Design a protein around this ligand. Structure first.
Ligand code: SF4
Ligand code: SF4
Ligand code: SF4
Ligand code: SF4
Ligand code: FES
Ligand SMILES: [K+]
Ligand SMILES: [Zn+2]
Lengths: 94, 114, 106, 688, 206, 125, 48, 231, 82
């Protein structure tokens, strides 16, 4: 979700951008500002919520030992999804 | 207050070594200016020797004085034998250091340091 | 695989780094996630020892297979987070296969 | 004589009866592992991490709760003890979540550290883990309750220290859950302390979340200036930035707690900061300039005005070094209009005698009193850590507490005598039944809040309260050395200003309006441009753009309390000093150095060039101001009482109402907390 | 026990017996003798005893520590004599190692052991260079590791890690110059020590 | 043979420290406060010596924290307060000593949780 | 990769880039964090 | 840190199978060459007595006939379980030390051969997770493993207080460390004993009565690397 | 003109006994006579007693009172006030 400030400089996924009177943007003249275009916050929001049967579910990020430490997520609250604290995948009790 | 001496058993013995080292440094300066092709004068070199000696003039411990002379002789040997290079000799003069403020107002304007 | 960053700003890599080459700052992301706002590696401090990737608990920071990245200026070797994420997106195809090949020895 | 002999690993130790096994081990320098035990809470005995073997006893005992018997040999390192610790640790970690990398406790976690030292190195738990839903308890404390180890420290703290019975356990067995049951917020002025006492990352600081790891922070031991208690703190910094505020143990002041304003208002130091000198331009607008230009402009005025034409007002966060520097500068133009925003009556002795404006009994002295009379004050919000000391005495000593003023909630039951100040006269006369309570008291305590002295009839109230203390001493119920009369201050800088000879209040400025006014961190709005001549030249020196800065002609950016080594005197007269944690931002400067620089440019150079020298000057004016951490003790109450009976001021008919009635008024009270976004979220939370 | 280092009581007993042997023969100088739990013998001596003790250990027929493995110093600022001089000797005849330790402060010289071991020559120059301990009667005592004109003794605990000066080339004077150190990134100090005691066996009395 | 020296021990001229970092520094001698986040007391055993904090600024290129203070990371450990004070004195550093803070001994009694007539009775376990 | 193709991910570069040093596409470092200390903005009116 | 990858030992065998031939080719160029012998024979002679007192070790001792090798006399790891011979010189000069180094290479192949055949199965780091980090799969599944992984990579393991001088027979000679632990997770003092330090200190002694070109030969026979000399 | 008087003394040392006696008896009378003169009494342990007088434009003098009597203190103040 890149966006360009009024001066035309892209804003990073951390919200950084030199303001109008900041001399430091001179470093990009004749070169470029390296900005990663694949904003993780936007990409994880495209994942569908996973519907599960149990009150408690576990996530290890997928891929077994290639994922993250396995944690267990409580799904009792019906006002919100259970979100994995490592990978951001969401779960809901059906 | 009973201690092992280094060289001198009292200040009078220690001050003899200090004077002997000053003599050696004083006579060396003209050779140093020539050997290292320094842009400083012999008077500037001898003034530098005096300043370095003067800053330690307040010592009253013969052991501390011995160490200062021991180190001063080591420094002289480095210079005479030309183990030092031109940069090492000129490090006594801090030519590229901008003068640092001395009075309260000047320091206050430039930062927080006392 | 979903595109979310693996790094959760635990700072184990920064703690273990023998050269103090890693600099990290973090805060809650707008969605509440624990993510870094700074992740710098001074590649001229780094000793390329691999302790960071040993320490990482989620396979986030790795040393890739590329060795042909010499530059014309010193400044180009001070990597920030965008450069390191771009390296990840650039090399993930090879990096993933190499990890698949060696992870059972770890 | 009364001590009994016990052995710790065969080493003889003499302990008083009632000493627990855990306490006996501490005497030989051995710390038994614990989770549920806290020396400042009631004993729980539920975590079982403190189990220890007693020689010739088949059953291990909970060292935290078990009183030690004569001749016992405590085996703190035997195989039986070690196996008990491993088993208990195994049970604690069975359901604990694999959260360390994402958990803020990591690196300073007692569960991690005692696992390393006293637990096994691997798992044999082959089942699924428990997971519990989180609880919302406010904007200050984040709860990740899957990490909770059910130690009940937070429950015991809330009930005993904070006097709030909102936390408990619901359910049974493995499903037992700590929380509030219903959706409720734990918003108490001492609530943030449950972050410190929770051994795990179940309770964590919401403002702090994810920002730092413990091993990388630098610790600056400093002092809190949000109230007049002077709580000892640690300022955590990283790479030149303030990261959080932690308590620092001091038994005689704040123990190991801080208030929520002390803990969470530090983010105000990152907003609305004065970073550059400013002067008015041709359009009448403030514009940035250099120190040379701004100081020259102020110096030109200081050389043109004299006597009553120059005045200064000191705000609530000003330090002693700046206070004496400004006094010395103004004295050099023969001006003695050095004022403070906080009022203290000058009738009688006024500030001549220190005992007239100190908490003479001392904060720790509350623990010895048997009766406390609070007059016109809400110590819960004026001095939260002093109110907690009262509740500690109310709880453990059965202290009797009575209040005159609004019937606020103090977290403990008290006797409300009413809110009319005429009650003070009834008590002094002897008609009121409470007078007998004071007479029968061996160690009575009378505390008049500095907030009540802000009324117009403040001198009348002080005389009346001081009159009650006079009667108590005349009767032999008191022990002589025991001090009865106390003033409870709420402003960090007040006592130091009074010690140095400042005039309390802005009455003198209102009597003799100045041509030139120095606002030294003064942001109380006490004196506006409506109270001053048309062309008054106002200089504001401070660290926040708030109330004083917008109306000034010149702004001199000063340092905040985290950015200087400065002296503050707390409500009991104890001098303490902060330390530099980070340097002042931008072009800001140490406050006393600005005044010293101004004095030189104006041709009135002050005779001190260093922090040490200005502190030598402080000694010349009041030797106690450099006796750091000492409580000197002031006398001559009779002389002060004899002078308060001369002029007879009348007591107004208004009831005593403290400025802070509810928690919503506690969060914002000074420039730093008013600029704090966390304090704004707390205010929003307790109103909606 | 696969993970635990095995004990060797035979060597512990041999080294203990030889430790008493040395103490009985040199009571004028020996202050303490200890054998570590991994079987290393240390003789702690008065600094006057450096030459007699080292000479004895080199030349005695029951000792024959002909090889000086290492000579170094340790800075402990909390001690009145902050410097601990450590001699690590080796005996090829008896296939054994011994350690001899003495002490000194900033101003008290130590006798040079060059007469006993020629190996000591440079080791003592390094100790002088890095710690500032002066060795009396050393044939050629001067810096060995630090740059010429270097001030201070970098291995002292109170010498900063990055020092006080740093070098660069200056075009104006056309030479390398020395200036006060400034770092683009300050070294980040870490507080790593756990607040919980790790080894009860080494607990000091309160 | 020994000599007699009655001078106060001072080694400032033979340590190689620049004068700026002897005469303008303020050493603080203290026992570090227990980290309130943890109950362990093992880090409150020894005496410490730190120096006054000085300026740190943001590196223009990276935003890293820069410093010009060579003593910014210097922390020394001492067994006693006297050892620390002696070390500061011979090095010429002006110093401040803060007395060790020892937790006051407490009176604990599990039985008090169930008092018949006192306020120490707990309402929950 | 003609026999063991790499796993496809939506974020992997579809176009490989060679070393770009010394060109206008070279990497330039910068601080990715936002401003820490917010300054007080004086009022834009001459009420003084 | 990690176990050998599958197939590595086969490749080490294929390399070792041909290496002695490479040594032979080297010896064909040098060992009997009269120019090589003129540059090395009777150059830099050191007596057995002097070598000991000057702190020499390794080949600088064995070239002079001293029968000493730490792998034999103070064995470490599994060196007591392999068979090999220690080459010993007779003239104490550069040529004999060169022959000692060439023969040591042959003995190294001989040891490598036994290692390839005697390699046992099992784990490759101590099964104590308070010292050695757990396996990654365990770290991602077990609570205890995650804690110990977290602590070992941040604080590191604490080492009991004490001091040791530990030495090995490094290729250049006795390489040792005097390591002082104060009980924490960071060493209090670490003095490094570099064998080349004492060898280079003996350059003046060994070069006496020789010509300028011989100084190059004597520096070479000591095998000096200034990373270990200067540290 | 006189602007301020400060008296420093110790709470327990015998050297301040005379100053202590003065404050016990004479101070209240003094304050009544000079209602608008700040007489700052500041006790601190183990200080030698002193009398500070501050005059116009920040000119200050100090007089020692060590081992003084209450009357010698009274004369010392009489000198300062006039
Ligand atoms: S590989 Fe580089 S960045 Fe990673 S731990 Fe090693 S030195 Fe640090
Ligand atoms: S890269 Fe890995 S180890 Fe480093 S902070 Fe991110 S998650 Fe932690
Ligand atoms: S509370 Fe401690 S053990 Fe539990 S996840 Fe957090 S750091 Fe790890
Ligand atoms: S939330 Fe924390 S303090 Fe409260 S019971 Fe659970 S572990 Fe204990
Ligand atoms: S500390 Fe004793 S049972 Fe918890
Ligand atoms: K916590
Ligand atoms: Zn997940």
């Amino acid at each position: 979700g890149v966006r360009t400030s009024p001066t035309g400089e892209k804003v990073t996924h951390t919200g950084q951008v030199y303001d109008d009177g900041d001399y430091r943007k001179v470093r990009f003249v004749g070169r470029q500002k390296e900005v990663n275009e694949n904003f993780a916050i936007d990409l994880i929001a495209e994942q569908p919520v996973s519907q599960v049967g149990s009150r408690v579910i576990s996530c290890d990020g997928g891929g077994g030992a290639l994922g993250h430490p396995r944690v267990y997520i409580n799904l009792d609250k019906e006002t919100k999804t259970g979100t994995c604290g490592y990978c951001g995948l969401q779960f809901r009790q059906q | 207050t009973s201690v092992k001496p280094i060289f001198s058993r009292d200040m009078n013995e220690a001050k003899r070594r200090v004077r002997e080292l000053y003599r050696a440094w004083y006579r060396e300066v003209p050779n140093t200016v020539h050997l290292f092709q320094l842009d400083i004068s012999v008077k500037q070199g001898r003034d530098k020797v005096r300043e370095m000696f003067k800053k330690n003039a307040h010592i009253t411990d013969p052991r501390v004085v011995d160490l200062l002379v021991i180190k001063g002789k080591m420094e002289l040997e480095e210079t005479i034998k030309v183990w030092k290079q031109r940069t090492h000799v000129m490090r006594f003069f801090h030519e590229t250091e901008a003068p640092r403020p001395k009075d309260f107002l000047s320091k206050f304007y430039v930062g927080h340091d006392p | 695989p979903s595109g979310e960053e693996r790094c959760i700003a635990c700072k184990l890599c920064e703690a273990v780094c023998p050269a103090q080459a890693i600099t990290i700052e973090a805060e809650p992301r707008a969605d509440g996630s624990r993510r870094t706002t700074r992740y710098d590696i001074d590649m001229t401090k780094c000793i390329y020892c691999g302790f960071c990737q040993e320490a990482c608990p989620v396979d986030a920071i790795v040393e890739g297979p590329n060795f042909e990245f010499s530059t014309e200026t010193h400044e180009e070797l001070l990597y920030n987070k965008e450069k390191l994420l771009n390296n990840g997106d650039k090399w993930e195809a090879e990096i993933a296969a190499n990890i698949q090949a060696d992870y059972l020895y770890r | 004589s009364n001590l009994i002999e016990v052995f710790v690993d065969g080493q003889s130790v003499m302990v008083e009866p009632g000493t627990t096994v855990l306490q006996a081990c501490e005497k030989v320098g051995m710390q038994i592992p614990r989770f549920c035990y806290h020396e400042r809470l009631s004993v729980a005995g539920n975590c079982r991490m403190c189990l220890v073997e007693i020689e010739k006893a088949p059953k291990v005992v909970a060292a935290c709760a078990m009183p030690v018997m004569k001749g016992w040999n405590i085996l703190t390192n035997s195989e039986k003890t070690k196996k008990a610790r491993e088993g208990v640790m195994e049970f604690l970690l069975a359901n604990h979540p694999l959260d360390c990398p994402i958990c803020d406790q990591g690196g300073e976690c007692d569960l991690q550290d005692q696992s390393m030292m006293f637990g096994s190195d691997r798992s044999r738990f082959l089942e699924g883990k428990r997971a519990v839903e989180d609880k919302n308890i406010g904007p200050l404390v984040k709860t990740i309750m899957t990490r909770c180890i059910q130690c009940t420290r937070c429950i015991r703290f809330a009930s005993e220290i904070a006097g709030v019975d909102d936390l408990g356990t619901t359910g049974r067995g493995n499903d037992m859950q700590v929380g509030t049951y219903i959706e409720k917020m734990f918003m108490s002025e001492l609530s943030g302390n449950i972050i410190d006492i929770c051994p795990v990352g179940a309770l964590t600081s919401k403002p702090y979340a994810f920002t730092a790891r413990p091993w990388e922070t630098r610790k600056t031991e400093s002092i809190d200036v949000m109230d007049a208690v002077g709580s000892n703190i640690v300022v955590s910094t990283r790479t030149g930035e303030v990261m959080r505020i932690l308590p620092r143990m001091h038994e005689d002041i704040n123990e190991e707690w801080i208030s929520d304003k002390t803990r969470f208002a530090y983010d105000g130091l990152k907003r609305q900061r004065l970073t550059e000198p400013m002067v008015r331009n041709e359009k009448g607008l403030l514009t940035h300039t250099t120190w040379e230009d701004a100081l020259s402009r102020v110096a030109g005025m200081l050389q043109s005005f004299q006597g009553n034409d120059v005045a200064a007002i000191a705000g609530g966060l000003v330090d002693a070094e700046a206070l004496i520097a400004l006094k010395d500068l103004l004295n050099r133009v023969d001006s003695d209009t050095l004022c403070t925003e906080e009022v203290f009556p000058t009738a009688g002795a006024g500030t001549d005698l220190r005992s007239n404006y100190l908490l003479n009994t001392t904060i720790a002295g509350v623990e010895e009193a048997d009766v406390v009379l609070l007059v016109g004050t809400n110590p819960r919000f004026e001095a939260p850590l002093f109110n907690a000391r009262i509740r500690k005495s109310w709880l453990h000593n059965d202290l009797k507490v009575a209040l005159i003023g609004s019937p606020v909630d103090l977290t403990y039951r008290y006797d409300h005598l009413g809110d009319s100040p005429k009650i003070l006269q009834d008590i002094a006369s002897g008609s009121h039944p409470f007078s007998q309570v004071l007479q029968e008291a061996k160690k009575p305590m009378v505390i008049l809040g500095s907030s009540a002295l802000q009324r117009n009839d403040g001198a009348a109230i002080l005389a009346a309260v001081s009159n009650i203390a006079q009667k108590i001493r005349t009767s032999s119920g008191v022990t002589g050395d025991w001090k009865v009369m106390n003033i409870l201050h709420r402003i960090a800088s007040q006592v130091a200003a009074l010690d140095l000879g400042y005039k309390p209040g802005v009455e003198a400025i209102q009597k003799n309006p100045p041509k030139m006014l120095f606002l030294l961190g003064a942001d109380g709005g006490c004196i506006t441009r409506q109270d001053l001549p048309k062309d008054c030249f106002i200089v504001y020196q401070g660290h926040h753009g708030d109330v004083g800065a917008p109306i000034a002609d010149v702004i001199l950016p000063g340092a905040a309390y985290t950015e200087k080594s400065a002296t503050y005197v707390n409500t009991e007269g104890r001098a303490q000093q902060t330390k530099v944690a980070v340097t002042p931002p931008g072009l800001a400067r140490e406050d006393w150095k600005i005044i010293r620089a101004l004095s030189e440019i104006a041709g009135m150079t002050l005779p001190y060039d260093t922090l040490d020298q200005v502190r030598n000057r402080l000694e010349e004016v009041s030797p106690n101001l450099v006796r750091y951490d000492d409580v000197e003790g002031a006398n001559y109450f009779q002389q002060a009482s004899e002078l308060s009976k001369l002029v007879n001021q009348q007591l107004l008919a208004d009831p005593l109402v403290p400025p802070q009635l509810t928690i919503k008024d506690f969060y914002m009270t000074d420039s730093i907390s008013r600029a704090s976004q966390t304090m704004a979220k707390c205010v929003k939370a307790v109103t909606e | 026990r696969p993970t635990v280092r095995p004990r060797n009581d035979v060597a512990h007993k041999q080294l203990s017996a030889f430790g008493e042997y040395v103490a009985e023969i040199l009571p004028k100088y020996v202050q303490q003798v200890q054998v570590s739990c991994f079987n290393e013998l240390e003789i702690c001596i008065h600094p006057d005893g450096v030459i007699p003790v080292l000479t004895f250990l080199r030349d005695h027929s029951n000792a024959q520590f002909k090889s000086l493995a290492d000579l170094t110093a340790v800075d402990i600022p909390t001690r009145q004599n902050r410097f601990e001089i450590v001699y690590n000797l080796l005996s090829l005849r008896f296939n054994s190692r011994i350690r001899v330790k003495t002490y000194t402060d900033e101003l008290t010289p130590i006798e040079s052991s060059v007469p006993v071991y020629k190996a000591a020559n440079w080791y003592e120059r390094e100790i002088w260079d890095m710690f500032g301990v002066f060795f009396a009667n050393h044939p050629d005592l001067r810096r060995i590791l630090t740059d010429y004109g270097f001030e201070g003794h970098p291995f002292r605990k109170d010498f900063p890690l990055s020092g006080y000066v740093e070098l660069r080339y200056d075009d104006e004077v056309k030479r390398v110059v020395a200036e006060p150190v400034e770092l683009a990134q300050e070294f980040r100090k870490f507080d790593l020590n756990s607040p919980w005691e790790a080894f009860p066996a080494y607990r000091q009395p309160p | 043979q020994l000599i007699t020296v009655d001078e106060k021990l001072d080694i400032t001229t033979i340590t190689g420290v620049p004068e700026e970092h002897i005469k303008t520094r303020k050493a603080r001698i203290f026992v570090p406060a227990r980290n309130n986040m943890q109950s362990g007391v093992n880090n409150t055993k020894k005496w410490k010596m730190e120096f006054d904090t000085r300026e740190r600024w943001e590196n223009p290129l990276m935003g890293w924290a820069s410093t010009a203070d060579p003593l910014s990371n210097l922390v020394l450990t001492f067994s006693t307060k006297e050892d620390a004070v002696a070390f500061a004195e011979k090095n010429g550093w002006s110093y401040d000593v803060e007395e060790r803070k020892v937790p006051k001994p407490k009176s604990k009694s599990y039985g008090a949780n169930f008092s018949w007539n006192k306020r120490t009775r707990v309402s929950t376990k | 990769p003609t026999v063991k193709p790499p796993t496809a991910r939506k974020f992997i570069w579809t176009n490989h880039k060679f070393n770009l040093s010394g060109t206008p596409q070279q990497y330039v470092p910068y601080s990715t964090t936002r401003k820490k200390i917010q300054e007080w903005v004086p009022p834009s009116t001459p009420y003084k | 840190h990690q176990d050998l990858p599958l197939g590595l030992m086969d490749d080490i065998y294929e390399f070792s199978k041909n290496f002695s031939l490479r040594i032979d080719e080297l010896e064909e160029m040098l060992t009997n060459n009269r120019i090589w012998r003129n540059r090395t024979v009777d150059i830099g002679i050191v007596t057995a007595e002097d070598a000991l007192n000057y702190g020499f070790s390794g080949v600088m001792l064995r070239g002079s006939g001293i029968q000493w090798d730490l792998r034999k006399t103070q064995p470490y790891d599994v060196y007591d379980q392999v068979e090999f011979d220690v080459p010993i010189g007779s003239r104490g000069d550069c040529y004999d030390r060169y022959l000692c180094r060439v023969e040591e290479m042959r003995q190294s192949i001989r040891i490598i051969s036994q290692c390839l055949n005697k390699m046992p199965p099992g784990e490759i780091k101590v099964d104590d997770a308070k010292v050695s980090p757990p396996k990654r799969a365990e770290m991602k599944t077990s609570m205890e493993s995650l804690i110990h992984h977290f602590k070992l990579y941040t604080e590191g393991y604490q080492v009991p207080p004490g001091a040791t001088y530990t030495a090995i027979e490094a290729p250049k000679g006795e390489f040792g460390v005097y390591l002082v632990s104060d009980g924490s997770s960071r060493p209090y003092r670490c003095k490094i004993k570099a064998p080349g330090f004492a060898h280079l200190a003996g350059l003046d002694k060994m070069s006496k009565g020789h010509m300028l070109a011989d100084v190059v030969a004597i520096i070479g026979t000591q095998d000096i690397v200034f990373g270990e000399v200067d540290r | 003109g006189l602007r301020e008087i400060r008296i420093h003394l110790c709470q327990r040392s015998p050297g301040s006994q005379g100053v202590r006696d003065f404050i016990e008896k004479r101070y209240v009378e003094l304050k009544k006579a000079n209602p608008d003169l700040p007489i700052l009494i500041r006790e601190c342990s183990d200080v030698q007693p002193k009398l500070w007088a501050r005059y116009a434009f920040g000119q200050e003098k100090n007089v020692s009172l060590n081992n003084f009597s209450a009357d010698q203190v009274t004369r010392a103040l009489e000198n300062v006030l006039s």
